[PDB]
Design a protein around this ligand. Structure first.
Ligand SMILES: [Cl-]
Ligand SMILES: [Cl-]
Length: 164
């Protein structure tokens, strides 16, 4: 298992514009297009992202390309963030994947906000960080996905994703 396979499981793959869990226009593998309520604005951001007149539909190759860009950006956002970088550097390879997943979902800003949890992860207090991560809107709104990510932080293994 790896970060790409992990996120492909959590986000799924859709080739036509759809609405995410928050009701925002998205496409591909969890690629947020716009927070705006307008489908046109969404089609416009899609075309600009792909570089062609899409008609709200993309191919698999195009979806994967946005995905690759998005994972790359997630990583870079972590390494440039004063609060995230040190956590990420302190973690083992499996747990780093869990942090990337959170950033991909909620953005760097969002994750950097989990101050207490971050400190606990940095300290390697797994069970305690897991309980603290669960006390969040994130966990209450997307519980199955949050449980998966939290279990990875708790155990350092990919067991939570094996079966899916
Ligand atoms: Cl883009
Ligand atoms: Cl969920």
């Amino acid at each position: 298992m790896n970060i790409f396979e992990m996120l492909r499981i959590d986000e799924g793959l859709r080739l036509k514009i759809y609405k995410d869990t928050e009701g925002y226009y998205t496409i591909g593998i969890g690629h947020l297009l716009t927070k705006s309520p307008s489908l046109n604005a969404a089609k416009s951001e899609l075309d600009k992202a792909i570089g062609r007149n899409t008609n709200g539909v993309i191919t698999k190759d195009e979806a994967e390309k946005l995905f690759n860009q998005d994972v790359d950006a997630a990583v870079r956002g972590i390494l440039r963030n004063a609060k995230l970088k040190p956590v990420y550097d302190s973690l083992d390879a499996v747990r780093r994947a869990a942090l990337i997943n959170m950033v991909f979902q909620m953005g760097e800003t969002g994750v950097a906000g989990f101050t207490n949890s971050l400190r606990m992860l940095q300290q390697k207090r797994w069970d305690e960080a897991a309980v603290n991560l669960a006390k969040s809107r994130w966990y209450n709104q997307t519980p199955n996905r949050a449980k998966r990510v939290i279990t990875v932080f708790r155990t350092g293994t990919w067991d939570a994703y094996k079966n899916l």
